[PDB]
């Protein structure tokens, strides 16, 4: 494009985005997060519940009440997340002049940052989605 | 505002389907019809004004977030916008509606050697007077206010500028309003001709002079004085020659896919030199097979509704209160030979001489 | 007999022929507007002033000229306007018939004399008429009178409509044509605007239960259409503004963008189509450029003002608020539904 | 996890990672409630239900009568089957032009005596004319058919 | 973003109206006032179902 | 009209709790005529009073004569005049939809 | 020249992955000017001589 005196705005800049963060969300307390890198290779998980029910003696013409327990088992119901990331042949050609390399490392980095942050964010979406579907009125 | 504000609320992301767009359009209908001169009508109740100023300021997103040196509060808070008014708007807003955070602002002053070239080059082109022609922030008082949860300058610049100058001040633009008004209508249904109470508006004569259809309408003028619209006013346009300009209408209507029909109502024959006994009898058996379908001009028992329903074809042939349109043989002089000749069926019109020539649905 | 002269006989007699009219009136209002515009809404390039050496009659004229560039550096929308308050309305709630004799070019009558009598008859009963000696080679400008009484008088063109139309339709904001239009009702095709305009085989979109309310101003060559269409330019020679003009001209539109974007774009103040400094509301004066906002005019919608069929009916005998009844026996009253509701005291 | 392919002009990647969510709640930990209202999607319109959009029932003998009945019922109703009545098709009614005020709410009719207890309509009622439905689970599941037949 | 936010869930409601029902009982065809509603004819179009 | 079905979880409580939440869509969305549930529809649509098999009467009027009151305010309140009738709105939607 | 990026959400279910979207908006600079009147009488020139 026709050249000029251009002159960088000499102070005036713009940002691209505003990055979102999980623990900054007030909802982060509703969920106990925990790392578990070997999740993709899991087979089936369960959790145990033992519960003791309180009993208060009642004297009179009623059947004798005896102490009892209860046991509860649950499933490890699991989902997945996916995303996409398209790269042109010219860019990989460039990374396979130096100013173009500088602008490109920049482009690819922008795209990957975006994809990762999306992944995260969407985590809260999935969490909220499950809470609604398990919440009665 | 009246359009933009609901947009950011009811539009989730864009590309809303037909039904969502229709619902949104209706919502904007209602929103504009209600809240368009909203301050003047709702001036007595202060809270809502603040309520929706908070909406408008936090309803327009930001722009690019450049800031290296910029206007700011004495406390140091970064100012972010400006709201312009007039003197009256200034006074009523600052009376008790809003609250002031600060009475003056910190302002950038830089952004003058080059401007002096104008004075030195001024007399240079005229005379020898060139040698004689020339021979960080600041605290400035300004109005700052907090609306909703945000800061804004609020100014009514009318004394500093635009005062005692031939140029008029903007923001006092004009608004067009299209008033629609029924004038000589009548409710057909006697079921709708009900009285709210028996003795509402009665007279001393035996017959009520209110059963009669209205002949005019009344309404308030600029200063609210009752005024008159009557049919005599309509005479200035409805009596013109333009009512009889159906020529181009016939031109246009002749170019559509037209199907054949019985000619019992358009064909005119001549006397066959007889005693009318043989004539009508022969016409009688002729009329036995002359009817290939239901004639169009038989269902006058229909009421307004199904009549104006799109199913009735007759509507596309109802065009002018002064005429009727119909299908007739082409290339035939009237009166014509009694045997109806084969012809390409065209469209013709007849005069509604009597007002009663209008079909009874109307 | 329904002929125009006989019609005039009944009209100036007091008799009611079996026909009714819907009337329209375009009226202006002097407002105040409010605006907010964020912080960095406009990038404003300043150039260099320069002086121009021009000779004046008694002296010299140093005209200064400066280049200045403005660019909206906003990704979306960064400023908002909003109508704020009433100043005194610039015009009046006028009631003046739109005489059609101001247009020449239509098919004349067989006899000139009857036309002349018609023009002379309609000369009475109106505050506006063409001057009798028939100004030829000109715009047929009406003769002015003495000082204006109560502001720029308004004109009201008329439309025929059947005597029995559902009054409930007029009780709210509605359309004089009898059927909605405008590209606003789209989403599928492009050359469908005409279908919205004139298709009577498919029902009215606003009322999906009937074709249209008035079959006399809704058809491809209806009387109203043939009489009021902008393309039909029947009234082109007439110098007075048409309040009804915008409502039957199919507005030119492009389908490049979606409905929402151009809806937003065209909603802002377009150049006015009316004459202000005049006193009888001529057409838009050539070379005139003043900014007037036109809401509810691109909506193809109109508003019903306060009105009544009977005077004493129009108010309630309480030394207070006005009337509130709708229909008593056969007459009717329309509660005002325009936004001009809690203003203009009575 | 990464999974790559060639693209139309370049390359395309997909990144997938699993998740496992489990409710550690003995009872209930979450409640939802509607709060407020927006502009309704559909309208409060009127729409006559047409039975001609389905076939199969025993038809009238003289086909002319059936066709005339369909033709005359086409009038007075907005939606209708397309005129030529294509055979072995979806019988989709002709689409109209741009719509106006949201989804048009379909309305059906039920025959019922001229004089019924109108008070039954003065509150919450059941169009079947007989309170029915599962209405929780009783002791025996066979009750419901007895309830509503 | 181009994803629909949850919590804008929609609710379906069914509605019933009577069509032309008529009250059987004669004593149920009672008016609160005598000269409340009238027309021009001698016989009111109000007993009409 | 079609009778419902029940499968398991003999406790009525946690059933009536579970199907009470938003079942999948039952009617078409993007059409303007409410076609059948288009196959593959995935929308989280709650139906109160529906599994309960219930409908509500809106504000309905046998004639516009008695629909309103001529006092610039409330609408009609008369119930039965001679043979016509009003059903005052019993639906949950009695606080919206201005006239 | 503005380059704007749009955040997205990692999702799942019976939907293929969606691609992140760039948008490159450009607006042309609009040029304008204003001027004002300023006259000087002849005798002033006479005195400047």
Swiss-Prot record, chain E:
Superkingdom of source: Viruses
Subunit relationships: Homomultimer. Makes the hexons and eleven out of twelve pentons. Interacts with triplex proteins 1/TRX1 and 2/TRX2; adjacent capsomers are linked together in groups of three by triplexes, heterotrimeric complexes composed of one molecule of TRX1 and two molecules of TRX2. Interacts with scaffold protein; this interaction allows efficient MCP transport to the host nucleus. Interacts with capsid vertex component 2/CVC2. Interacts with the small capsomere-interacting protein/SCP.
Protein name (record): Major capsid protein
UniProt source species: Varicella-zoster virus (strain Dumas)
Subcellular location: Virion; Host nucleus
Entry similarity comment: Belongs to the herpesviridae major capsid protein family.
Lineage: Viruses, Duplodnaviria, Heunggongvirae, Peploviricota, Herviviricetes
Residues of the full protein shown: 405 to 453 of 1396
Chain's role: Self-assembles to form an icosahedral capsid with a T=16 symmetry, about 200 nm in diameter, and consisting of 150 hexons and 12 pentons (total of 162 capsomers). Hexons form the edges and faces of the capsid and are each composed of six MCP molecules. In contrast, one penton is found at each of the 12 vertices. Eleven of the pentons are MCP pentamers, while the last vertex is occupied by the portal complex.
């Amino acid at each position: 494009l026709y050249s000029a005196q251009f002159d960088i705005l000499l102070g005036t800049y713009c940002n691209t985005l505003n990055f979102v963060r999980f623990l900054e969300l007030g909802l982060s307390v509703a969920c106990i997060c925990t790392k578990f890198p070997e999740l993709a290779y899991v087979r089936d998980g369960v959790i145990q519940f033992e519960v003791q029910q309180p009993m208060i003696a009642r004297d009179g013409p009623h059947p004798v009440d005896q102490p009892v327990h209860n046991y509860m088992v649950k499933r490890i119901h699991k989902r997945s997340l996916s995303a996409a990331f398209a790269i042109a042949s010219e860019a990989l050609s460039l990374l396979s002049d130096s100013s173009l390399r500088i602008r490109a490392i920049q482009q690819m980095a922008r795209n990957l940052r975006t994809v990762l942050d999306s992944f995260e964010r969407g985590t809260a979406d999935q969490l909220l989605g499950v809470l609604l579907e398990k919440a009665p009125p | 505002l009246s359009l933009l504000s609901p947009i950011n609320k009811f539009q989730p992301e864009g590309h809303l389907n037909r039904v969502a767009r229709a619902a949104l359009l209706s919502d904007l209908k209602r929103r504009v019809c209600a809240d368009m001169f909203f301050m003047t009508r709702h001036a007595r109740e202060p809270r809502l004004i603040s309520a929706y100023l908070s909406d408008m300021v936090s309803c327009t997103q930001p722009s690019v977030m450049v800031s290296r040196i910029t206007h700011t509060n004495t406390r140091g808070r970064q100012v972010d916008g400006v709201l312009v008014t007039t003197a009256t708007l200034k006074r009523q807003l600052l009376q008790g509606i809003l609250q002031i955070d600060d009475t003056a602002a910190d302002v950038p002053v830089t952004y003058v050697l080059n401007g002096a070239n104008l004075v030195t080059a001024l007399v240079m082109g005229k005379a020898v007077r060139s040698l004689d022609d020339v021979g960080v922030n600041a605290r400035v008082p300004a109005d700052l206010v907090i609306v909703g949860d945000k800061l804004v300058f609020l100014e009514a610049l009318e004394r500093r500028v635009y005062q005692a100058t031939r140029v008029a001040y903007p923001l006092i633009g004009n608004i067009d309003i299209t008033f629609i008004m029924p004038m000589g209508v009548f409710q057909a249904n006697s079921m709708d001709r009900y009285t709210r109470h028996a003795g509402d508006f009665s007279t001393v004569s035996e017959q009520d002079p209110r059963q009669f259809p209205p002949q005019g309408i009344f309404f308030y003028n600029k200063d609210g004085i009752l005024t008159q619209l009557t049919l005599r006013d309509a005479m200035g346009t409805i009596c013109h020659s333009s009512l009889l300009d159906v020529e181009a209408t016939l031109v246009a209507l002749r170019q559509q896919h037209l199907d054949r029909q019985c000619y019992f109502g358009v064909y005119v024959a001549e006397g066959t030199e007889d005693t009318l006994d043989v004539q009508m009898g022969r016409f009688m058996e002729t009329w036995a097979d002359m009817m290939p379908h239901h004639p169009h001009w038989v269902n006058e028992h229909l009421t307004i509704l199904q009549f104006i329903a799109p199913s009735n074809p007759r509507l596309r042939f109802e065009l002018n209160p002064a005429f009727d349109f119909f299908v007739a043989p082409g290339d035939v002089d009237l009166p014509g030979p009694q045997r109806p000749p084969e012809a390409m069926p065209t469209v013709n019109a007849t005069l509604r001489i009597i007002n009663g020539n209008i079909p009874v649905p109307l | 007999k329904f002929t125009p002269i006989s019609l005039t006989h009944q009209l100036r007699t007091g008799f009611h022929p079996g026909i009714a009219f819907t009337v329209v009136r375009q009226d202006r209002f002097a407002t105040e507007q409010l605006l907010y515009a964020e912080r960095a809404s406009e990038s404003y390039f300043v150039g260099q002033i320069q002086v121009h050496h021009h000779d004046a009659i008694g002296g010299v004229n140093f005209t200064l000229t400066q280049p200045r560039a403005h660019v909206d550096l906003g990704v979306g929308y960064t400023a908002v306007c909003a109508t704020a308050a009433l100043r005194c309305p610039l015009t009046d709630m006028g009631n003046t018939a739109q005489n059609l004799f101001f247009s020449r070019g239509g098919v004349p009558m067989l006899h000139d004399n009857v036309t002349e009598s018609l023009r002379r008859i309609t000369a009475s009963g109106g505050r506006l008429n063409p001057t009798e000696p028939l100004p030829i080679f000109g715009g047929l400008r009406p003769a002015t009178s003495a000082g204006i009484a109560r502001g720029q008088a308004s004109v009201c063109e008329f439309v025929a409509m059947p005597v029995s139309t559902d009054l409930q339709y007029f009780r709210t904001a509605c359309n004089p044509r009898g059927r909605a239009s405008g590209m606003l009702y789209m989403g599928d095709r492009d050359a469908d605007i005409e279908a919205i305009m004139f298709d009577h085989t498919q029902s009215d979109v606003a009322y999906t239960d009937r074709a249209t309310l008035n079959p006399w101003a809704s058809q491809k060559h209806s009387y109203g259409d043939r009489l009021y269409n902008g393309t039909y330019n029947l009234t082109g020679a007439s110098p007075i503004y048409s309040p009804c003009f915008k409502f039957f001209t199919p507005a030119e539109v492009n389908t490049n963008c979606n409905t929402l974007d151009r809806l937003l774009m065209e909603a802002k103040a377009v150049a006015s189509q009316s004459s202000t400094d005049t006193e009888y509301q001529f057409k838009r004066p050539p070379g005139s450029t003043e900014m007037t906002q036109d809401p509810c005019g691109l909506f193809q919608e109109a508003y019903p003002p306060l009105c009544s069929s009977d005077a004493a009916m129009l108010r309630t005998a309480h030394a207070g608020e006005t009337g509130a009844d709708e229909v008593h026996l056969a007459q009717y009253l329309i509660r005002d539904a325009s936004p001009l509701r809690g203003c203009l005291p009575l």
